[PDB]
Design a protein around this ligand. Structure first.
Ligand SMILES: Nc1ncnc2c1ncn2[C@@H]1O[C@H](COP(=O)(O)OP(=O)(O)O)[C@@H](O)[C@H]1O
Ligand SMILES: Cc1ccc2c(c1C)CN(C(=O)N(C)C)C[C@@H]2c1cccc(O)c1
Ligand SMILES: [Mg+2]
Length: 320
């Protein structure tokens, strides 16, 4: 029912003790509280479904948040996970992850691997000896300036925008004409698909201003089981400093959440590509979770509070 919201604070980064700044964030995992030093000894505290402190490692996030959700997907449910927060707090780090330096590990064992890679690898492990018969297909579409880009098409230039239509076989669904859905036959072909995505994104960046920060990345994985059909959408949202208290999809997401939370009969899903595509994840029939990433630096006070207030109110959304 209620959408689950969790907070994840990134740890300090070298140049983060330079420009004068102290950790104004205190996370308490057992009490599921995040406390912020707002004083200029005053503070604001918020309780979430889960709170992960700066020391939280990727494996901890997967085990605690992802595994449970993946089991749901394998059961035939639709699930979505959002990463929301200002640029620089770890949205991509959490959803995608990074490669450890000096080629110390292969992708499947990289402790810095994020949610997407771990999920893909685990699907094959969990569905290997049990019942059996299943197929996995992934797609990675990114939204920038209300235009859709396919980061997985090999036979197309990343700059070819995609067009979406309402799904005549739906009502709340849309069709993304030309979207590449790649079949992942086995764990051994997962990484190359990610590298391909990584490459096309690099190209998109040279073409579009502040691309990686303003873009909304939607990595979807659909599992056909033999029956049952489960879909997991992993969404790395545009930086929240892109709104506040330009980016039509971000603005609309916030308005959609506001409408859902106040119980207003009209929810503006159609006012943006992002909300039309993810309509069923917002007060729909999909199980939704939001991971609000924040910074410990006193310099990010304002954005951190904004993010916490935004995510906190989101816990009042009911999906089904
Ligand atoms: N939990 C984390 N642990 C270690 N480094 C992190 C974490 N989250 C973010 N970082 C670092 O902070 C910087 C920005 O992370 P990034 O994922 O790009 O944020 P965002 O996607 O929200 O813009 C990079 O150095 C990234 O490795
Ligand atoms: C959609 C997606 C998901 C995850 C990830 C990338 C992309 C595009 C790109 N990455 C890459 O570094 N490349 C080069 C694919 C980072 C990353 C990842 C994958 C595997 C293991 C790991 O430790 C980090
Ligand atoms: Mg990012």
């Amino acid at each position: 029912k209620n959408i689950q919201v969790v907070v994840r604070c990134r740890p300090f980064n070298l140049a983060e003790r330079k420009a004068s700044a102290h950790s104004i964030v205190e996370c308490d995992p057992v009490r599921k509280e995040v406390s912020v030093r707002t004083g200029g000894s005053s503070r604001k505290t918020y309780t979430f479904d889960m709170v992960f402190g700066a020391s939280t490692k990727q494996i901890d996030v997967y085990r605690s948040v992802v595994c449970p959700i993946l089991d749901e997907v394998i059961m035939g449910y639709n699930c979505t996970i959002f990463a929301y927060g200002q640029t620089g707090t770890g949205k991509t780090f959490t959803m995608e992850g990074e490669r450890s330096p000096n080629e110390e590990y292969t992708w499947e064992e990289d402790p810095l691997a994020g949610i997407i890679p771990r999920t893909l690898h685990q699907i094959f492990e969990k569905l290997t000896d049990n019942g059996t018969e299943f197929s996995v297909k992934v797609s990675l579409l990114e939204i920038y300036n209300e235009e859709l880009f396919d980061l997985l098409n090999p036979s197309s230039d990343v700059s070819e925008r995609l067009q979406m239509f309402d799904d005549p076989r739906n009502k709340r669904g849309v069709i993304i004409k030309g979207l590449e859905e790649i079949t992942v036959h086995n764990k051994d072909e997962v990484y190359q698909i990610l590298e391909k995505g990584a490459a096309k994104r690099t190209t998109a960046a040279t073409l579009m201003n502040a691309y990686s920060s303003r873009s909304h990345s939607v990595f979807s994985v659909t599992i056909h089981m033999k029956v049952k059909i489960g879909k997991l959408n992993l969404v790395d949202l545009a930086g929240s400093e892109n709104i506040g208290r330009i980016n039509q999809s971000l603005l609309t997401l916030g308005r959609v959440i506001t409408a859902l939370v106040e119980r207003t009969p009209h929810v503006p899903y159609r006012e943006s590509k992002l909300t039309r595509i993810l309509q069923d994840s917002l007060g729909g029939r999909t199980r939704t979770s939001i991971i609000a990433t924040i910074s410990p630096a006193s310099l990010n006070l304002e954005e951190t509070l904004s993010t916490l207030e935004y995510a906190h109110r989101a816990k009042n959304i009911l999906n089904k």
